[PDB]
Amino acid sequence: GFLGAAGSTMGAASMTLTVQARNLLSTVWGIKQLQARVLAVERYLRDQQLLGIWGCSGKLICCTNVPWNSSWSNRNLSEIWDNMTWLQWDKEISNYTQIIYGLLEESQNQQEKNEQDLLAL
């Protein structure tokens, strides 16, 4: 369905990430419809901009160069990707996101400056 694998395995919900990402685009009923559509467009363009600035644009899954911290999650991979849902994960890590966002941005900024001078030969 739309997001019927929300309570599923985290490793099994990675298959169905396509069909959840297609539905972010879709007088009393005048300017209200207009405001709702503009707000949806703003949220989707903000998400695509945040993918683009980190350098993972055009890809639903991306792999980066930021080291993971033991203080962020002491749990190993045998429980996160086997018997733990994305909702419990995001409730666990809801107050830890901004530092990881800044480190991803810093790694993307430092990665590009070491490639412009590489092709100058």
Binding site: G4, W29, G30, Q33, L39, I80, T97, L103
Partner: protein, 438 residues
């Protein structure tokens, strides 16, 4: 382990937004989008959620939407500012049977015609609740001490039709499926649906009309039921069928008040007049009150006597049972319908009573002259709910008197939008994975 980025993970978070409705009138349907044939539904298996019905912004948004749609519709209609003149009224005498002595006033007044310098002499029957005695006798209309107001156009209809508040693009309407659901508290069985069901915008004050039947037991829902000032919503299992009708046979005469406008008035009654009597079955109501007291004893004390009574307010819209049968506004008894003391085929006739000048949505002066409707009116409707209010009584042999009530119109829509909460999805997420960039 390394940081990796995922787009489109199923993660939601609570928020509020501007929903929209669709359907297949005073509620404007021609401005809405058409709904889909073969609708969809998604069940979220194996998940938990912490719903609350007493703090939705959906209810306030719906109340604002119905107020806006109601105020929009009466805007292109007749304003009736020449209408209140010094009315000279005599009683009707001609086919009075006992009980309507002194309720229909036959009024004579004179009025501007199509032309400006000419007056015509007309007449109309007005109800007693719409005339106020200025000191045959000189009466005036009740309305123009506070406001002059708009006659409803005779083509729009006040019949509720189902509307479906859909989610916007990027949000989700979460639906509960647990049967014994208190409102405040977790729902183990949660589903995602992109549209709500057919919520009918019905207007009632004490005995909530056509709607969703609960399928479990009769449910007593409140937010601080211990406190003595919160409305207690009760939802039934089986519907209680109620008859109401108007035995009179009205005829419309059309008085031309200006170059283009018209004022539809009561003519003369063809036949005999009687009260608008409202029926409800004895045994069905007895069994329903039995179920209510059965589910009320557990929570309110395992050995209680439960007393029902009648209302004690002063305004006519809270001590009565108002509804919208056919287009004529009723304002009924509900006092002999609640005369019982539960301790540890007949029909109850309710005198239902009709008033034309309507101050609804609890606002201090924007009325509506409801046009007369020609012929008899008969409605068959389902009682699916009940608004109760406990007294300020403390103790004395566990005696709690549950008088009816109402007032605020939000309580008629938290009996239908209780299994719904809007959330926004947040697709961005990070997780440990073995990846590195190349």
């Amino acid at each position: 382990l390394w940081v990796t980025v995922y787009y489109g993970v199923p993660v939601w978070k609570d928020a509020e937004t501007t929903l929209f409705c669709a359907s297949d009138n005073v509620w404007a349907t021609h401005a809405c989008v058409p709904t889909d044939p073969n609708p969809q539904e998604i069940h979220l298996e194996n998940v938990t959620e912490e719903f609350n019905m007493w703090k939705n912004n959906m209810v306030e948004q719906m109340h604002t939407d119905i107020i806006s749609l109601w105020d929009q519709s009466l805007k292109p209609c007749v304003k009736l500012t020449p209408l209140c003149v010094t009315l000279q009224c005599t009683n009707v005498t001609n086919n009075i049977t006992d009980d309507m002595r002194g309720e229909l006033k036959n009024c004579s007044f004179n009025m501007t015609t199509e032309l400006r310098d000419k007056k015509q002499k007309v007449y109309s029957l007005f109800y007693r609740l719409d005339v106020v005695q200025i000191n045959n006798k000189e009466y005036r209309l009740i309305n123009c001490n506070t406001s002059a107001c708009t006659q409803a156009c005779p083509k729009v209809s006040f019949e509720p039709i189902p509307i479906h508040y859909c989610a916007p693009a990027g949000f989700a309407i979460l639906k509960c499926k647990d049967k014994k659901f208190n409102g405040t508290g977790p729902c183990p069985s949660v589903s995602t649906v992109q549209c709500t069901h057919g919520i009918k915008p019905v207007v009632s004050t004490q005995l909530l009309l056509n709607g969703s039947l609960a399928e479990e037991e009769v449910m007593i829902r409140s937010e601080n039921i211990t406190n003595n000032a919160k409305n207690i919503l009760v939802q039934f299992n089986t519907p209680v069928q109620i008859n109401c009708t108007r035995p009179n046979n009205n005829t419309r005469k059309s008085i031309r008040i200006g170059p283009g406008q018209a004022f539809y008035a009561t003519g003369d009654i063809i036949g005999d007049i009687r009260q608008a009597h409202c029926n409800v079955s004895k045994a069905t109501w007895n069994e329903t009150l039995g179920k209510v007291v059965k589910q009320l004893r557990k929570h309110f004390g395992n050995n209680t006597i439960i007393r029902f009574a009648n209302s004690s307010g002063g305004d006519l819209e809270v001590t009565t049972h108002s509804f919208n049968c056919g287009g004529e506004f009723f304002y009924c008894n509900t006092s002999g319908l609640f005369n019982s003391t539960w301790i540890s085929n007949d029909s109850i006739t309710l005198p239902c009573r009709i008033k034309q000048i309507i101050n609804m949505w609890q606002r201090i002066g924007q009325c509506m002259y409801a046009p007369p409707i020609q012929g008899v009116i008969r409605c068959v409707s389902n009682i699916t709910g009940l608004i109760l209010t406990r007294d300020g009584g403390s103790t004395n042999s566990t005696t709690e008197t549950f008088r009816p009530g109402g007032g605020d119109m939000r309580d008629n829509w938290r009996s239908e939008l209780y299994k719904y909460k809007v959330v926004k999805i947040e697709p961005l997420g990070v997780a440990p994975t073995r990846c590195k960039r190349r």
